[PDB]
Amino acid sequence: NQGGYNTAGDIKYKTADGVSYDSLWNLFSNVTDEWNKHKSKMVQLMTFPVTNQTEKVPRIGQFGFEKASEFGVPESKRTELSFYQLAYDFEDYDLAFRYTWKFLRDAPSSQIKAYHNQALQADAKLIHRKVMEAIFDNREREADIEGLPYKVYPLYNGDNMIPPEYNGTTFSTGHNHYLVSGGTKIDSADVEMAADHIREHGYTEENGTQLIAFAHKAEIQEVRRFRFGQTNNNSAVANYDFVQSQGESPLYLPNADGLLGKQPQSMWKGLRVKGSYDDVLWIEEPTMPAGYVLFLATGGTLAQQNLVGLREHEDAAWRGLRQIPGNQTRYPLIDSFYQRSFGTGIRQRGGAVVLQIKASGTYDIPTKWTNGGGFE
Amino acid sequence: AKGVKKLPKRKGTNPIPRDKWNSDDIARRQLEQDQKLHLTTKGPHTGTNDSFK
Distance from CA of B1 to the nearest CA of A (A): 31
How far is A206 from A197, CA to CA, in rounded Å?
Answer: 16
What technique determined this structure?
cryo-EM
Chain A, 7 to 46: residues with Cβ < 8 Å from chain B are none
Which of B16, B28, B49 lies nearest to residue A150, judging by beta carbons?
B49
**Closest C-alpha to A311, from A138, A129, A92:** A92
**Cβ atoms of A15 and A273 closer than 8 Å:** no
**Cβ atoms of A302 and B31 closer than 8 Å:** yes
> Hey, are the CB atoms on A278 and B39 less than 8 Å from each other?
no
**Cβ atoms of A60 and A79 closer than 8 Å:** yes
Max CA-CA distance within chain A? 113
- Given CA atoms A341, A347, A353, A357 in this order, what sign does their dihedral have? positive
Burial of A264 (0-12, 13-18, 19+ CB in 10 A): buried
Amino acid symbol at A249: S
How far is A296 from A347, CA to CA, in rounded Å?
Answer: 14
- H-helix or E-strand spanning residue A38: helix A34-46
**Cβ atoms of A340 and A126 closer than 8 Å:** yes
- Closest chain B residue to A205, measured at CA: B18
**Cβ atoms of A7 and A98 closer than 8 Å:** no
**Cβ atoms of A145 and A313 closer than 8 Å:** no
How far is A254 from A242, CA to CA, in rounded Å?
Answer: 12
**Cβ atoms of A266 and A246 closer than 8 Å:** yes
In sequence order, what E strands does A123-168 have? 141-145, 148-152
Q: CA dihedral defined by A232, A359, A282, A365, rounded to 10 degrees?
A: 180
Phi, psi of A310 (to 5 degrees): -100, 120
Q: How far apart are the first and last CA of chain B?
A: 69
Chain A, 311 to 350: residues with Cβ < 8 Å from chain B are 314
**Closest C-alpha to A21, from A106, A117, A120, A97:** A106
Chain B, 29 to 48: residues with Cβ < 8 Å from chain A are 31-32, 34-35, 37-45, 47-48
**Closest C-alpha to A320, from A338, A336, A302, A308:** A338
How far is A40 from A54, CA to CA, in rounded Å?
Answer: 29
**Cβ atoms of A21 and A15 closer than 8 Å:** yes
Chain discontinuities in chain A, listed by preceding residue (C to N exceeding 2.5 Å): none
How far is A40 from A126, CA to CA, in rounded Å?
Answer: 10
Q: CA dihedral defined by A239, A241, A245, A249, rounded to 10 degrees?
A: 160
Distance from CA of A183 to the nearest CA of B (A): 27
How far is A196 from A204, CA to CA, in rounded Å?
Answer: 9
How far is A125 from A116, CA to CA, in rounded Å?
Answer: 15
How far is A237 from A181, CA to CA, in rounded Å?
Answer: 15
- Closest chain B residue to A85, measured at CA: B52
Distance from CA of B6 to the nearest CA of A (A): 18
Which of B27, B44, B47 lies nearest to residue A150, judging by beta carbons?
B44
**Cβ atoms of A181 and A357 closer than 8 Å:** yes
> Hey, are the CB atoms on A54 and B41 less than 8 Å from each other?
yes
How far is A275 from A259, CA to CA, in rounded Å?
Answer: 12
CA distances from A5 to A14, A39, A104, A336 (A): 22, 30, 11, 11
> Hey, are the CB atoms on B44 and A151 less than 8 Å from each other?
no
**Cβ atoms of A100 and A335 closer than 8 Å:** no
- Closest chain B residue to A57, measured at CA: B37
How far is A314 from A236, CA to CA, in rounded Å?
Answer: 51
How far is A354 from A361, CA to CA, in rounded Å?
Answer: 15
Any bridge partners for residue A337, and if so which? Answer: A96, A324
CA distances from A57 to A61, A63, A80, A278, A335 (A): 13, 19, 12, 33, 52
Reduced DSSP (H G I as helix, E B as strand, rest coil) percent helix, strand, coil of chain B, to 5? 25, 10, 70
How far is A324 from A317, CA to CA, in rounded Å?
Answer: 12
A263: DSSP letter: P
Burial of B39 (0-12, 13-18, 19+ CB in 10 A): exposed
How far is A222 from A355, CA to CA, in rounded Å?
Answer: 15
- H-helix or E-strand spanning residue A119: helix A109-136
**Closest C-alpha to A112, from A126, A98, A125, A95:** A98
**Cβ atoms of A300 and A208 closer than 8 Å:** yes
Phi, psi of A284 (to 5 degrees): -65, 110
How far is A48 from A51, CA to CA, in rounded Å?
Answer: 9
A206: DSSP letter: G
- Closest chain B residue to A279, measured at CA: B16
Which residues lie closer than 8 Å to A195 by C-beta, 6 or more apart?
A211, A278, A279, A280, A295, A353
